[PDB]
Amino acid sequence: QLVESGGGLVQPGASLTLTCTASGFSFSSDYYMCWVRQAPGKGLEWIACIWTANSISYYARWAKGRFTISKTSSTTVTLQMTSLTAADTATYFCARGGSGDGQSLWGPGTLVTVSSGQPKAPSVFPLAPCSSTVTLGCLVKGYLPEPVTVTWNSGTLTNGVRTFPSVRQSSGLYSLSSVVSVTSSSQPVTCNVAHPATNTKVDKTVAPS
Amino acid sequence: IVMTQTPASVEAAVGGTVAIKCQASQSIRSYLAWYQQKPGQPPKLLIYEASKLASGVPSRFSGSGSGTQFTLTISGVECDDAATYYCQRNYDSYSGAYYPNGFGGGTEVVVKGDPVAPSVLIFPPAADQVATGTVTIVCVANKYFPDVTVTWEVDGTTQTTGIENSKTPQNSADCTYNLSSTLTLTSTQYNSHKEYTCKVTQGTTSVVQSFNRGDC
């Protein structure tokens, strides 16, 4: 498969290099390795492709002069980015295509956040009403950058979880909620919240009322 | 070469057919790909060389066209098909290479399923929020279709700021949404008022949940 790495929070004006790492196949076989980005809530945007056999590269007209694509080994391709702006905030994907046959293989993406400010850890607050069935949850408030991870009962609680998309508030900080529906026969529910950018780890058991 | 998709968004009934258009400003023959992207996931290849289905793609997806004008059709729409669809140029005539490159702008497909009225929950702020200087009240609208609008009133005054809305993607099985609406105020503002109301409206129907800062 494919895995992107290198994303994180950077200031406007920064440079940054991302890496796309291949497993199970080799860039010594003939493929186009490409980078595609997607700003939050916007469309896919092609950046550049490289032909792994000879390193011939092709660039979007907005990228040439500011982004560089490179084959650095038989398992890695990089994307060097310079003079970053807030509008470069996006998920950056690497994808593999052949000749004329689309891109069947994509990585999960790495998030690049170009913003002023500094990392901030989330506060975690329980959500409960002021009943044989009840919805409880955790509010994960005021963090930067994305992502946070939220599981319940360390991922063994299955039925009835709804984790909503994060929202970026006008302050530039994000917030996210996750709720779970339980019956009176249930055991306690614990949300496990992690914010890797700040090495934050919090477990919160939420009780009714 | 410029790639243009229309429309920007389209609503289709379960079981219906919807067609999406992609235009190239100069001919790319058959070298056009289509992708599906569900919120929070990488895109998945649907169609390559304008009409060839990728592996594992159900046959209700079809593509057509060659040159400058292309169509993606979903024949027998399912709730799972709620997604954004993109076309991609796969040929560069300057260089005569076939690498996958520029995208169209994307088309969002909304699926019209059976209507379902929302139930509503309001979550008063946990006690330790207020010492932080701000307070966030959460209102949830569960399992509903079609879309709702949310109104917050504080002591009867409609709020017009401090509000954020987040909607889960349409459910693959029943087309429904879920919605989290937050009202954020300063601790001074929160302590200055008493009644906090979340009003969820679905067409001509309204569900309201409220609490009082003294009763929790």
Contact B160/A at CB under 8 A: no
User: How far is the C-alpha of B130 from the C-alpha of B152, rounded, in Å?
Assistant: 19
A46·B125 Cβ contact <8 A: no
- Residue B11 CA, distance from chain mean position: 12
Choose the closest CB to A106 out of B43, B99, B166.
Answer: B43
User: What CATH number was assigned to the domain covering residues B114-213?
Assistant: 2.60.40.10
Contact B146/A at CB under 8 A: no
Looking up tokens 């497909």 gives B109
In the three-class reduction of DSSP (H, G, I as helix; E, B as strand; rest coil), residue B40 is classed as coil
- The CA distance from A180 to the nearest CA of chain B, in Å, is 11
Instruction: Locate the domains of chain A by residue range.
Output: 2-116, 117-209
Please tell me the experimental approach by which this structure was elucidated.
X-ray
Q: List CB contacts (< 8 A) between A126 and chain B.
A: 126
Contact A81/B at CB under 8 A: no
User: What CATH number was assigned to the domain covering residues B1-113?
Assistant: 2.60.40.10
Nearest to A38 by CA among A124, A107, A132: A107
Q: Entry resolution in angstroms? A: 1.8
User: How far is the C-alpha of A85 from the C-alpha of B210, rounded, in Å?
Assistant: 42
Neighbours of A83 (CB within 10 A): 11
In the three-class reduction of DSSP (H, G, I as helix; E, B as strand; rest coil), residue A85 is classed as coil
B90·A101 Cβ contact <8 A: yes
User: How far is the C-alpha of B28 from the C-alpha of B35, rounded, in Å?
Assistant: 17
Tell me if domain B1-113 and domain B114-213 are identical in fold: yes
User: How far is the C-alpha of A186 from the C-alpha of A161, rounded, in Å?
Assistant: 14
Helix H or strand E encompassing A37: strand A32-38
Which amino acid does the sequence have at B164? E
Neighbours of A141 (CB within 10 A): 21
Looking up tokens 């800062």 gives B213
Residues in chain A: 209
Which amino acid does the sequence have at B27? S
User: How far is the C-alpha of A116 from the C-alpha of A35, rounded, in Å?
Assistant: 25
B100·A58 Cβ contact <8 A: no
Contact in structure between A182 and A112 (CB atoms under 8 Å): no
The three-state DSSP-derived secondary structure of B64-120 is EECCCEEEEEEECCCHHHCEEEEEEECCECCCCECCCCCECCCEEEEEECCCECCEE
Widest Cα–Cα separation across chain A: 67
What 8-state DSSP symbol labels residue A144?
Answer: B
Looking up tokens 């009840």 gives A134
Instruction: Locate the domains of chain B by residue range.
Output: 1-113, 114-213
At the topology level, CATH places domain A117-209 in Immunoglobulin-like (2.60.40)
Token pair, residue B11, equals 């609503």
Contact in structure between B28 and B100 (CB atoms under 8 Å): no
Contact in structure between B196 and B154 (CB atoms under 8 Å): yes
CB-neighbour burial class of residue B156 (10 A; exposed 0-12, middle 13-18, buried 19+)? exposed
What lies within 8 Å, CB to CB, of A28 at 6+ separation is: A52, A53, A74
Residues in chain B: 216
- For A49, the closest chain B residue by CA position comes to B99
User: What residues form DSSP beta bridges with B42?
Assistant: none
Neighbours of A193 (CB within 10 A): 23
User: How far is the C-alpha of B162 from the C-alpha of A161, rounded, in Å?
Assistant: 26
Give me the residues of A, 150-179, that contact B with CB < 8 A.
Answer: 162, 164-167, 169, 175-177, 179
- For A35, the closest chain B residue by CA position comes to B101
User: How far is the C-alpha of A92 from the C-alpha of A46, rounded, in Å?
Assistant: 10
> What are the start-end ranges of the E strands in chain B?
3-6, 9-13, 17-24, 32-37, 44-48, 52-53, 61-65, 69-75, 83-89, 107-112, 119-123, 134-144, 149-154, 157-158, 163-167, 177-186, 195-202, 205-212
